[PDB]
Point group: D3
Chain length 161, copies 6
């Protein structure tokens, strides 16, 4: 019995990393449709504007047919309801991640009871990768090429040099 | 674009709890087909024989149309391959759970690279519930009715009284 | 042998949540007198002024006879000494909470050796509730009524709308 | 407004350590009456019989006027109800401890809703001390005198030599 | 100012894994001399006898000039004192590991104050690898070749087939 | 076979605490040479300027012959390469520390593959000590003398009074 599963994968993606890419690629294999959903996150003062983050995520998800990249600024749950998504995908890289995802998953069960939160663990290759430490390394001209897709490295380097 | 997602939900289920039931019910809503897969687990010396555990899981999953209950004794990954499952569902109740699931998910990526492990957090109602503590409470005639489906409570009480 | 136990329950309470209320209600049942102690916390830039937070905590603790609400800006330990409190009550919602409470409890043992720190775990109903995520949800008009006492919801909604 | 607070401090205490002693001493200062409650724990196969563990705990709690030592084999919650205790005291030495205490506290809220579970963190002097590692060190004639009260060291050494 | 640093790396090594090998290789690069120290561990009922575990560790550490493999059954601290070691090397694969190592490091500071405990994190390649799960996978004929040195895989397979 | 081990111990040290001092003293006993390396950390807005932090660390490490104090603002890995250090020493006070050190150690393995990261656990005396909580206590005139070397206490008190 075939089904349409529509999933959202929301985050700040500032910038999208090899870790994010691994997760959305796996979500893409599992669900009928995936929205890679980029939170405006204004109060976080992101390095990249929302438009830049949308452009970068489009470049790296281009080969995934059933993935669409969209910017949003409302609650992730309202965004899911707006797009008729029934699954919310989140990454769990470690124990510190777990606390917050548990709180958030419970909040979201209250806000949208039929939205199911599901968690994916990145491959051990990428699991230690953190947008913030990569940005800190790049600020000092350290080599970050192992952690970011090629077009993302190029934009991070331009944004700094 | 509709898809057939076939998931396995493996565990010892000795006995199946309200926590397990919440997870398989959610898996059932998300995937085309779910096998609730009961590990023989001989070296764990379960309270209930495999047959008893299969019978109890059938009683409590009866209303879920797309769920099938099966006993197995091989590796969970080989079991998934045998049944053409592409998703392995596991519960994460807390931080202690996370360590082991991370190790197991990585092992399973090696054994069956196209099998995707996905994690679900039980509702806060059930998250503290642990088959072992419930069994310990039942051994002393404590009331365990909040933690187990009714037929499971009845069989636990008979197995002890 | 009857005793006077005087406890302080200190925090930022910005705003007081159903979690805080559950803890102070339990502290109230256990100890002769409880001061719900609201830290000025200026460097945290709270959403609500100290006066507003005191007023809200008075509204929701009104039915607890042996609870008094007081604003303070000194060290919690000096505040306890000033009010002759022998017990300092803190909540532990999760593992992340534990680290900080351990550090703080040890600091406080040095500052006031006869002040005893004791920890309470909120009911599973409220344990995921975090003032910061509730405030984030409210900023977007999400429904926060399950997480806050009614007068607190009303003041949060006015403070934002 | 003076109150009678009756607390139970239950555990296996095999044997009672400097950590246990620090906790019961603090409980003794806070509550009207403390029962140091020693679980038979038969299925744990303790090093010391219940009688030996009761005798050792009596020797080290002798100076605490309001502490009574009692052996029990029922549920800790039924034991508390039997003795009219309204507080259940448990130690939290670290994060691993937290998981289990959370599960247990929630179970006990179901079994005895008016019994309040409260947690104490041992002094940094004793917090790493674990009955099992001390027993392992003693088996090889390592010096364990820093970790156990003097009469407990003496009985551990006799039980082994 | 050149120094002789003598380190011990103690464990059950049942059997030695790619994780153990990565750690001893790194210890070998850092210290003048490393004893890979294999605990008899009788009460753990190891899969491999002490002699077999010593032989396997010799095969895989053969290329490391400054490493010596020795079986022991006393306390690791007394073993270090016996061999004039001033450094005790332990692996930390995750958070669960941390609790126990902290307890053990503190115990060892008491038993041998001049012995320094130092911790190494395995490469992300090997960090999820656990002797017990590998043994469980091998029992069912799963492929374990990514996790063990070649001679260890060969002996594990003979020990089971 | 004697060796030159050159270690770096990098941090913000704002200000150097009894915990830092315990670690550098232990590093000093183990390695031929230790650079106590003080990160400019401009974006952290430290309480003490880099020069003040260098001066304070020189005062408290004066008795350690093989320790040198240096300020730096590049990546810790490039700093190590610049000074020919082969060991990077970091403290692990608790579980929360572990997450970040794991990420950082993995980043540093990429940036400088022959630099070995090694971890030390402070003595239980100092393990709860956190520069930030000490600074918070000092701001209110709480007694911080147990947590800081005497010259550091004196400079913290002048910097505030």
């Amino acid at each position: 019995n075939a089904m349409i599963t529509k999933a959202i994968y929301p985050g700040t993606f500032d910038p999208i990393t090899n870790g994010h890419l691994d997760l959305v690629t796996r979500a893409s294999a599992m669900f009928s449709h995936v929205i890679l959903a980029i939170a405006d996150s204004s109060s976080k003062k992101p390095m990249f504007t929302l438009d830049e983050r949308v452009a970068l995520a489009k470049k790296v998800t281009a080969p995934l047919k059933n993935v669409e990249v969209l910017g949003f600024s409302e609650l992730m749950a309202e965004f899911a309801k707006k797009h008729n998504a029934n699954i919310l995908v989140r990454g769990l890289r470690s124990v510190s991640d777990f606390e917050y995802e548990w709180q958030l998953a419970n909040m979201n069960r209250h806000l949208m009871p039929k939205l199911e939160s599901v968690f994916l663990i990145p491959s051990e290759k990428w699991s230690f990768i953190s947008s913030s430490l990569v940005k800190e390394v790049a600020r000092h001209g350290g080599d970050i090429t192992p952690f970011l897709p090629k077009p993302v490295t190029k934009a991070l380097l331009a944004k700094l040099a």
